[PDB]
Amino acid sequence: MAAAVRQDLAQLMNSSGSHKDLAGKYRQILEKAIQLSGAEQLEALKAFVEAMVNENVSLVISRQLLTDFCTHLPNLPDSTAKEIYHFTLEKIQPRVISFEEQVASIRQHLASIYEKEEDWRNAAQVLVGIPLETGQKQYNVDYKLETYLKIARLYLEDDDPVQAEAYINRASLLQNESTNEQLQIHYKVCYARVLDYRRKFIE
Amino acid sequence: KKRFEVKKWNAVALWAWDIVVDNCAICRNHIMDLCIECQANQASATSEECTVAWGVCNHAFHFHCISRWLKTRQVCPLDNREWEFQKYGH
Amino acid sequence: VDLENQYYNSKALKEDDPKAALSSFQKVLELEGEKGEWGFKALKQMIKINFKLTNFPEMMNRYKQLLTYIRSAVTRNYSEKSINSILDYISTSKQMDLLQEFYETTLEALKDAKNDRLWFKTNTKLGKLYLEREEYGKLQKILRQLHQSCQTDDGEDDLKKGTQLLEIYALEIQMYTAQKNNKKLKALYEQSLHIKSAIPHPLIMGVIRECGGKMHLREGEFEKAHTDFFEAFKNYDESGSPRRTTCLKYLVLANMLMKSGINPFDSQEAKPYKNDPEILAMTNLVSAYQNNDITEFEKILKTNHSNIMDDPFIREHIEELLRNIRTQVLIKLIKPYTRIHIPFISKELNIDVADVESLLVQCIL
Amino acid sequence: SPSNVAIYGGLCALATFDRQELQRNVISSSSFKLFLELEPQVRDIIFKFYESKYASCLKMLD
Amino acid sequence: SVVNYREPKSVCKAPELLAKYCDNLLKKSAKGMTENEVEDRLTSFITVFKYIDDKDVFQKFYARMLAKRLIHGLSMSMDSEEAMINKLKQACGYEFTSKLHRMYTDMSVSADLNNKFNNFIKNQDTVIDLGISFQIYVLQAGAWPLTQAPSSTFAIPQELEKSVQMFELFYSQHFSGRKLTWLHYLCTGEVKMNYLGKPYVAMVTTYQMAVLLAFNNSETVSYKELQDSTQMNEKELTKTIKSLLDVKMINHDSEKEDIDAESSFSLNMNFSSKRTKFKITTSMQKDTPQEMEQTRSA
């Protein structure tokens, strides 16, 4: 069935059709891919990513369907999702500036598996992978803040104060423009710990 | 008929920090552009950027600005929490 | 208009042989060298073939039609860029024997004073070549021609990211540092400062500074060295490597001797390059000097021996830097006591009683 | 003659000058430096006196 | 007294009119001005410039202008530009001029990169063996008045897609740990029309090229359709559509129609020109006066 998806994609590959129709057809194939279970699901999804990252696909199409493709991923089991996240990140890389949001989204999701499974370092390192100030796209104050804070918290858990202090320092400058109170309270609690862990007791 | 191709094409680019927004808040001037303290002082004006202090954070502000603040209160006013130096710019 | 020159040119770009080509390259020129650029790019391509196959008297002869389009309808500002591109390619592809003549024939055309930068850049290239070739006489000749400018390298013109006058001062400083006479270097440096105000941003300003900083360190005017090396580093970033690595040792050294107001790293100098272990030692060494802790300083000197010790300039002061740390450490220490023993302070500093005794005497005076 | 200025400015300073003045005028000066270099005997005498090297200094001095 | 006091009022007017004037000389015209003609013009300019109290406004306007003129490559006399900065350096002080110089030096770095890429042709490629000529200029963000942020999150059309990806891959080799962020707003390319009976090569902005490729699939295309395809702000799209409509590369359903979002935009098969290798760029003509106006209000 994964092989059949590959066939169907190859055949649409050289098409120059209308956005709404062409995207509707890939969407049908995507739905086909998601209802597979086992090795077929993983394979068809990998095959789907290989087709999206091909240079014969329009960027309009690829950005849309790749948003679509991301939201179906957390719903899959952890092993499948993790594998796919890694593959998709390697494959998106040549046009990374065009799928920046999708890279970010995948990485929040990829980090969330690593956090659950108590593999702190990869979860932090994954989040570090998300561009927030150096990209084309400049995300809302809170998103960026959430990413810096999550990164800092994860380093504190792994007993590494130096990395933590770097990202918690980057978090502080957003904290004041943040207009969610809870997130600002998390920030302070986390900072207090970062000082704690740095043997900077008096502060 | 209506077929196309391109050898070589890009769009002009930039590369930036590692600064957030509002022109690096501790002065109203850009990180590359000279602060209040630097421009008013003038005795030697460096060929690229003058004197920028990089933080542990990797977000930077003027040296003179944090330095004037440091005398009364060791703490950095925007961070509101303590600042140690780490890294030097270009 | 442009349409005929484009077809004629695309047809000349074939043949793939210098024969049958010459007539095809010619015809774009025949229409008029107005724009001139179709005619220029055509002409450039024949030079490329000519150094590869053919024969060099043939190459030189084709080159001379662009040299004489300089008073024609081909713009100044294009012709200079066009020239920089070809000259750079030819320098890499072939040796000095042949290469020298190309520069010489370019200079021939340029006589008339509307050819400032264009004359300067080529004249410079002859200069670099001559020292390599081991020529003394013609090297003098160029330099006297360059000398005539007072502040200047441009009429008001564009490219003057070198200088005329200052290059001569730089080459002279490069000779006088290898010959090693301290005196002349000091006079050369003061005499070069007067010119500096109307210069823009060049490489030449850091090179001249670099010698001045070293002479200042020898003098006792550690502070004049710090600022000249600091001021130099920015331009050294624009050109880039390898000198940034060596300059960075001269900068850290100078900053320590002032006693103190340390900034080789809350100012700006190297942000991604500092991570390499070569420059890394210096950062750690400076951190040990600012806290004024003896045990760390000595650990770095032993561990990463080569990266500090191999350079002779920095190596010379090192004894003084050791004394400097120990002297500051002594003034901190002294304060809880009113009776402190000499073998106790010698043991704490990590040296014998006699050098401490000698330090104390000089310290009280 | 230029030999005698080095001698005169050195020995004539050392007698009457205190420490602050010695460092500021004879040592830190670019001008005197050609003269100090011209004969090392005058120069060694100044430093040796300053360092509390009186035993080496007086020996060169006699 | 006389230089300061004359018929136009506010003070800010004075650097702007002076800026526009410098820019009017500095950009290449129909045939351009010879060497040294500009240098005499400039000399008179430096005395008037001294009298200005609000030099800050000048410095900023002249900075943006120097940036546009360098990026477009529409500078008549590079010598004139330098001459203007060199004249300012004596009067002002060294500092004033440092940023203008820092963007100039930065071009030399960019120039050398452009060549790196151009040399990359000689090596085994077969995707670098196709259409149109090169442009790039990788620069520093705070060393030029150019702010980045989202330009508009432009999709970038298919045609243009290859060649950006190859250079994006190349570029990580040069500098590791740095990301390229595109200024779609300044870029200009070319389009060739095979839908006209007399071929013309239009010099177009990338947005106009984006709006132009859509016509290939369906002859006349709605405003709602371009918004999806091109992926650009409705405001930024109005200015581009407007320009594209003003010259008759694109034409409305009838002989005369107003520029609205409720009408599809059909391709014109009756476009004529008085020059072959026509140009239209370079954003809207209106934007420069509007920027000046809007800026003044700010």
Give your account of this protein's structure.
The structure is cut from a larger assembly and holds chains A (about 200 residues), B (about 90 residues), C (about 375 residues), D (about 60 residues) and E (about 300 residues). Chain A is an all-alpha fold and about 200 residues long. Chain A contains ten helices and no strands. Chain B has one domain: Herpes Virus-1 (2-Layer Sandwich). Chain B is built from two helices and three strands. Chain C is built from 19 helices and no strands. The termini of chain C are far apart. By secondary structure, chain C is an all-alpha fold. Chains in contact: A-B, A-E, B-C, B-E, C-D, C-E. At the A-E interface, helix 4 of A face helix 6 and strand 1 of E. It is classed as ligase. Keywords: Cullin-Ring E3 Ligase COP9 signalosome neddylation, ligase.
In short:
Chain E: It is found in: Nucleus. This is part of a larger assembly, with chains A (203 residues), B (90 residues), C (365 residues), D (62 residues) and E (298 residues). Chain D is mostly helical and 62 residues long.
The H/E string of chain E reads HHHHHHEEEHEHHEEH
**C-alpha Rg of chain C, in Å?**
29 Å
The coarse silhouette of chain E is: globular
Instruction: State the separation between the terminal residues of chain E, measured CA to CA.
Output: 28 Å
- Percent in helix of chain C: over 70%
Structural class, judged by helices and strands of chain C?
mainly alpha
Task: Provide the spatial order of strands within the biggest beta sheet of chain E.
Answer: 4-6-5
Class computed from helices, strands and strand pairing of chain E: mainly alpha
Assembly context of the chains = part of a larger assembly
How can the largest sheet of chain E be summarized?
A: 3 strands, antiparallel
Count of discrete alpha- or pi-helical segments spanning 4 or more residues of chain E: 10
- Please estimate the helix content of chain E: 40-55%
Please give the radius of gyration of chain E in angstroms.
22 Å
Q: How many strand segments of chain C? A: 0
Chain pair sharing the greatest interface: B-E, 27 and 51 residues
Number of beta-strand segments of chain E: 6
What form of chain C results from the Cα inertia axes?
A: elongated
Order of helices and strands of chain C: HHHHHHHHHHHHHHHHHHH
How much of the sequence lies in strands of chain E comes to: 5-15%
Q: Helical region count of chain C?
A: 19
Modified residues (N6-acetyllysine) (chain E): 20
Keywords (chain E): Acetylation, Host-virus interaction, Isopeptide bond, Nucleus, Phosphoprotein, Ubl conjugation, Ubl conjugation pathway
Subcellular location (chain E): Nucleus
Modified residues (Phosphothreonine) (chain E): 288
